[PDB]
């Protein structure tokens, strides 16, 4: 009834000066499970809510190792995600090989931006319908980088993506002052509470559905699955 | 069931405004039409079973194989026509042998299903696979959806009525389950969904254990099994 | 319906996309005039600038393909610059291969071949620009050549491209109906008169850009504002 | 044959005897062996012959005998034989005649479900395709007739089942669900409102007749019609946006709006207002615009059922002004239709005094009085947009080798709609509105030269529409400019020899030629100037330039001689009055008034015809005698000179067809033996032929015969002059002041517009004054065109002899053209065939 | 009103009016963006834009609409940021190649031409869409004065004494016209630029913005740089005081 | 259907200017109208007639840019043959290859067919030759034809006026007659382009001799 001529393909500009396909792909990342990334002065964390098709099903792997000093949390399409992960892993490996050096996060997100932008301008290649939270420690300091199918990228004290990210964004922007001077455990706790902000009241954070990915100056990027997250989870106060 | 259709569907590489890829989601919906199969993961080992659906007596039963061997320590099951799967199967075999050649070590089931999903990307590809094998971690079961996503499952069913079997699997399954108890359980599920008397010709069963390699139960072994239940 | 959206034949056999490109040339909104003389050839065109901030110097529709060849472009500016660039490339390639400067006719021919490729191939839209070229050929003296988007290239005693090309051509035909073998000043006066009449503007010298070539000085030259004003004031007192 | 036999049987059917029915049954009833094909024979004979129309006293002699048996067969059979379609067609005819005398209650579900099966819609998760072995053969028109006939009555189950059907199938009407079924569904959607409205017209506004009246109990009620429209409207609103095009939807909305406007207009306007504004949903624009064309008259009519009424009219019109653009042909055409259709319905003039009026004005009336001021801005904007379309309509000949010299089909259509629309706006426009538009078009055409092929053609059509609206002042503006400029431009006199003819002259000549076709009496003021210009410019030696001058001559003669209705306004004598005593907003809509139609006819004045004859003697006869000299051994002249003279005389014939009497000759004696007399109809036709003068047609006939012989002997090569000679021979043979192709085009356009704007429901010839005038003029065209068998007349024989000689000529093109003219000549005269065959 | 033919769909297509609609649509997309200003001065050129802060969560100096395409030249962008970044990469690579071949810094009026040719190239083929970013490029050299060139999506390049792009480019243009940039030096011009980017901004229309400046000139030895914080604070304060 | 484009291309050819060919006993003539839109257009600059080789020349009716493309290809093909065989290309062989490229273009999708028909003439083996290669890729051999506007009319005029044995001068005359039929008027050396193929080799008739031939009528 309201079929739109100009959303058929990405190469098509609308008369309103918008790419409906890009907007829609950016709409897609919200389909995924919520994930939270935040940083202290010397630490950066990625807190994600993994979800399963069934109880027997183990859970999806939202958090991934790009390198020792960089990690990501995926939202949106997992295929597009795995492509990006392979590209980024190869780039970081190339940098270590050539320069004997860890890759800068700003540089990596820039490369991701170029790679993502390419499909937007080409007919028949759909955009990467994936949104990532890129977290790592470098010489400058800890960083949190958001990327979207639009191929735009940002730098954030903290950010949440996926379904119901907005409540977590509100808690995070409320307590962003506190996060900076926070120690590691407190920063993790803040991230966990923010992730809880997205959850429905029926759901409660558990060992299984929670995954914590954390990096530091003296600490490589790690991922904590079910038992490894339990100490961080136990301290968290009960929800209102 | 009247015609339900939207403008945004039928596009292969177009995001809907909700963000969904409906064309491929529908394609996944068709891929699930295949024959029903069940896989049970236990400490003792992995039990895979599937319905044969032979047309005629003249057909050689061994000729149609709905369970295959990727490696000695690996078994795999597929739903739908074997031909779509054959490419993935060949890739899995050749990849595990690349791993053996290069590293003199046995490829993990997680790595194998990962590499197959890496093929699947590099169409919807119209096959659902249920990899089951033993590894250094232990017996494991990985379900690879026709989407290409792969996850570990304590138990899983694929095919025409995977969901209905899955609900039964939820009730029966427990961690203490033995491979023998799982086999008797899995046969019960296939009996219900098939709604036909189980016999050696209409199913194929296979198992993997730490002690032994992939072993497909011979006709005599299957006869001893179904007779027990 | 699939015949106008790409370069393919109409039932009557006509290329609607090419007609639309000819329209786009007028959509550009500027007029150019060229005229030939016994000893020279000239180009005139308006360079009215809308914005005060925009530099008058950088904006010009006259370009140098080679030292002895000058051109003027009309229509879409970007397409004009691309065409100019390709002409420069072809001229240098010609010089490198054949050891002598390309003649204007061969250059126009090459460019028309290129435009032909776009009109023939559906993927590429026709380049919506029209080029007029002036140069001195040793055998034939001054020459003027004009290539449309379609690929037709023809020599002209005088010609016009732009929104008022039709009225300009009527004026030039009336002028050349008499023999009127024009020297340099006469060619310049003729060109400026055609443009001033057809646009009804009565230009100031800054308004227009003028380029010429001469048998005495084959080097393509862009007249400065002062020489242009000298020619215009000589015209006004006449 | 078979269709004619069936129509004859149906036409003779109602007068069959009362006793005829019983004997009809016994004759064919043995044939009803269901397994045998004689069943099909029987049912076909029954459907064709059995009278369904009888007065009620003898219904027992009529349909009571066979209705029960046939219905029992129809219901008992569940598979689909071929005869079942015929049977339901019979039942439908019976039901539509016998509205209330048949209960129809037991069989409503079975009928409706069988219709649904006829739709063959897919259903179910399996969605298994039907075998297709059985074709239902349920014509949707006949099913609709059955439904509307069984509609109404004390029992309302019919309405309930219709609503249940439409609600059941709403999903398929959705655009995203388009399929094969959609065509049949659109057919149903189009048919059913027409069924209901025709039933209502028969119920209420039909005159009494021999046919039985609809029983007052079973007559349709306001609640029943309201239930029907509420049942159907959502499907229609969905089908508006269907991929097919929504012509069916537009017609359905028209039919529904006649009866329930307050229901139907608001939703479509709620859709249409966004679609004008939106940039991303362009299909909505054309669909909604079309539907609004459908519902225009019910909208403007008002009537306090839909009180808002024409309040929406002018905003939609202003929004439609952007719609016209070069880019979109479909949008451009439908926007012309929108601007025109509402314009014709709506007399437009700024009714400022009405708001100032103290009383007698409804609130909506005052709102319209406020709106009417914007009409001047609207028309000026429309003219700006159209001039822009012309600026984007230029030919721009690209090929160096040649010029196109032709008009494409599409670019002719936009010219047609543009000129028609502009003429409608202007005749609807008031005096000052016309004056501003006149000055605008004059400034446009005068200031900017236009290449003649398409752009200049459109501008000249525009100026012609203006002059047609107000000839005296408009010609006072136009004619001196063109005459002075052309005489100033051609003063050198070497332009005559020049083939080029530089373009300003050619443009101005085209402009003059198009302006000239107007009421002759206004033209007669500009006599000496026009003829001086003609005498100068016929003889320009260029294929264009003498052709345009000849077209000017042709339009001049046709205007002076021909009879046509000049006014073509919605209100008779509308807007002539300066004072505000005339109340425009009252005039909106208001169709009908054929008795007070009051046509103003141009009739050839004595001065007009005298001037035409004088001019023809001035121009044709010198060229004619020049031809005669060329035919004799004298005045050896070029192919070009022969062509120019031929073009002159051909155009002079086509212009002067009415004046010059038909050719006469001695009848060929050996035609046939006929005891009864054979005669040719003589129709006065307002001709008043003057026989005192010598027949120009006759002298032209003898000379052109000689010249045909001369060129065939001496210059076979000159093909173009021979094309002209073929045209001239054909015109001289049959042309009597009218063109068959013009007549057919006018008839088709009238049929289309009458269907589009038809008020089927009430008034019973309730139609717009313009199409009424058009139909009268078409009646005149039919009268002058149609001619009975005429004497073979050995002059006409010799003309046919020349034509068959040219049909047997060397060159294929002249063979074909002469073959066409020869064919028409053979059709013309009775018993001409017997002579020419040997 | 709206056109449903399909001429406007593909860039490799002409409208019967003679207009390519895709590029005009891209120019409208450029118009629907935060304003960016570049003003030349006799010493050098200054670039000023309004970097709209979408959320306070975003840290600072992010979504940078200022780019250094080379050491001596810097870009200020508008429109779609991803496309602008692609263009920046193109310009960087072009400058790298020119330096590698010809052994000196690429001149303005050449870099702009090549980048324009890339842009224009994207216009006239069916597959690829036009770029959505218009941008300003400016550099200063001793041999050649302060240069500012603006590039639109259509592929046209023109030098500007002052230029502005975005939603309020017209208002910025009239304010810049109410100025004398030719004589004025870069440091005072910075104050002026802050004034214009402040006045054009609609606090109600756009919630809040972080002002980014950049300039290049004789004072910087012909190297584009991100404006010492003292000068930037002084300019923002001056602009707000002028605003009150 | 791809054939539809072929039909439309033939229509575009039919819109083209008149071109005429006659095959005399000792020579072949190729003639065409080159009517100039305006006096401003300079006739000397461009020739519709062009030679592929010394012994071959051709003329076109239809789209000039397509003609330039095809003549370039033909010249390269003839030179390729001359390199291989060190003898001049036969007229039929050249026509075949030119047809090959026309057929290749129309067969290829995403590209329109050529909008021109070519009349190819040459003298080889002490013999005249004439061919017409259409947009479809078909080539035929005629004694005489016309192309462009009124091509059927020209063909029938040729049919009536033709003789099996005629001299080069008489064929020149009948060609010019044939064009004089179609031409608007005021035919002159500038407006008309002529070429002949003979034992001497293909040559474009200069304006002086063309004026002589016109004066003969």
Curated annotation (Swiss-Prot), chain B:
InterPro entries: Ntn_hydrolases_N, Proteasome_alpha, Proteasome_alpha-type, Proteasome_alpha_type_5, Proteasome_asu_N, Proteasome_sua/b. Expressed in fetal brain (at protein level). It is found in: Cytoplasm; Nucleus. It comes from the Eukaryota. GO terms for cellular component: cytoplasm; cytosol; extracellular exosome; extracellular region; ficolin-1-rich granule lumen; nucleoplasm; nucleus; proteasome complex. GO terms for biological process: proteasome-mediated ubiquitin-dependent protein catabolic process. The keyword Glycoprotein applies. The keyword Nucleus applies. PROSITE patterns: PROTEASOME_ALPHA_1, PROTEASOME_ALPHA_2. Keywords: Acetylation, Cytoplasm, Glycoprotein, Nucleus, Phosphoprotein, Proteasome. The modification Phosphothreonine is found at residue 55. The modification Phosphoserine is found at residues 16, 56, 63. Component of the 20S core proteasome complex involved in the proteolytic degradation of most intracellular proteins. This complex plays numerous essential roles within the cell by associating with different regulatory particles. Associated with two 19S regulatory particles, forms the 26S proteasome and thus participates in the ATP-dependent degradation of ubiquitinated proteins. Belongs to the peptidase T1A family. This is Proteasome subunit alpha type-5. The gene is PSMA5.
Swiss-Prot record, chain D:
It is found in: Cytoplasm, Cytosol; Nucleus; Nucleus speckle. Disulfide bonds: none annotated. HEAT repeats lie at residues 307-351. Homodimer. Interacts with the 20S and 26S proteasomes. Component of the spermatoproteasome, a form of the proteasome specifically found in testis. The bromodomain-like (BRDL) region specifically recognizes and binds acetylated histones. Associated component of the proteasome that specifically recognizes acetylated histones and promotes ATP- and ubiquitin-independent degradation of core histones during spermatogenesis and DNA damage response. Recognizes and binds acetylated histones via its bromodomain-like (BRDL) region and activates the proteasome by opening the gated channel for substrate entry. Binds to the core proteasome via its C-terminus, which occupies the same binding sites as the proteasomal ATPases, opening the closed structure of the proteasome via an active gating mechanism. Belongs to the BLM10 family. This is Proteasome activator complex subunit 4. The gene is PSME4. The chain holds residues 169 to 1006 of 1843 of the full protein.
UniProtKB/Swiss-Prot annotation, chain E:
Its main location: cytoplasm. The modification N-acetylserine is found at residue 1. GO terms for molecular function: ubiquitin protein ligase binding. This is Proteasome subunit alpha type-3. GO terms for biological process: proteasome-mediated ubiquitin-dependent protein catabolic process. The 26S proteasome consists of a 20S proteasome core and two 19S regulatory subunits. The 20S proteasome core is a barrel-shaped complex made of 28 subunits that are arranged in four stacked rings. The two outer rings are each formed by seven alpha subunits, and the two inner rings are formed by seven beta subunits. The proteolytic activity is exerted by three beta-subunits PSMB5, PSMB6 and PSMB7. Interacts with AURKB. Interacts with CDKN1A. Interacts with MDM2 and RB1. Interacts with the C-terminus of TBXA2R isoform 2. Interacts with DNAJB2. (Microbial infection) Interacts with HIV-1 Tat protein. InterPro entries: Ntn_hydrolases_N (IPR029055), Proteasome_alpha (IPR050115), Proteasome_alpha-type (IPR023332), Proteasome_asu_N (IPR000426), Proteasome_sua/b (IPR001353). It is found in: Cytoplasm; Nucleus. Belongs to the peptidase T1A family. The modification N6-acetyllysine is found at residues 56, 205, 229. The keyword Glycosyltransferase does not apply. GO terms for cellular component: cytoplasm; cytosol; extracellular exosome; nucleoplasm; nucleus; proteasome complex; proteasome core complex; proteasome core complex, alpha-subunit complex. It holds the Pfam family Proteasome_A_N. PANTHER family: PROTEASOME SUBUNIT ALPHA/BETA. SUPFAM superfamilies: N-terminal nucleophile aminohydrolases (Ntn hydrolases). The modification Phosphoserine is found at residue 242.
From Swiss-Prot, chain F:
Pfam families: Proteasome, Proteasome_A_N. CDD domains: proteasome_alpha_type_2. One of its GO terms (biological process) is proteasome-mediated ubiquitin-dependent protein catabolic process. The modification Phosphotyrosine is found at residues 8, 60, 105. The keyword Ubl conjugation does not apply. It is found in: Cytoplasm; Nucleus. Induction: Down-regulated by antioxidants BO-653 and probucol. Down-regulated in response to enterovirus 71 (EV71) infection (at protein level). Keywords: Acetylation, Cytoplasm, Nucleus, Phosphoprotein, Proteasome. It comes from the Eukaryota. The modification N6-acetyllysine is found at residues 54, 155. PROSITE patterns: PROTEASOME_ALPHA_1 (PS00388), PROTEASOME_ALPHA_2 (PS51475). Phosphorylated on tyrosine residues; which may be important for nuclear import. Its main location: cytoplasm. InterPro entries: Ntn_hydrolases_N, Proteasome_alpha, Proteasome_alpha-type, Proteasome_asu_N, Proteasome_sua/b. SUPFAM superfamilies: N-terminal nucleophile aminohydrolases (Ntn hydrolases). One of its GO terms (cellular component) is cytosol. Component of the 20S core proteasome complex involved in the proteolytic degradation of most intracellular proteins. This complex plays numerous essential roles within the cell by associating with different regulatory particles. Associated with two 19S regulatory particles, forms the 26S proteasome and thus participates in the ATP-dependent degradation of ubiquitinated proteins. Belongs to the peptidase T1A family. This is Proteasome subunit alpha type-2. It comes from Homo sapiens (Human). The gene is PSMA2.
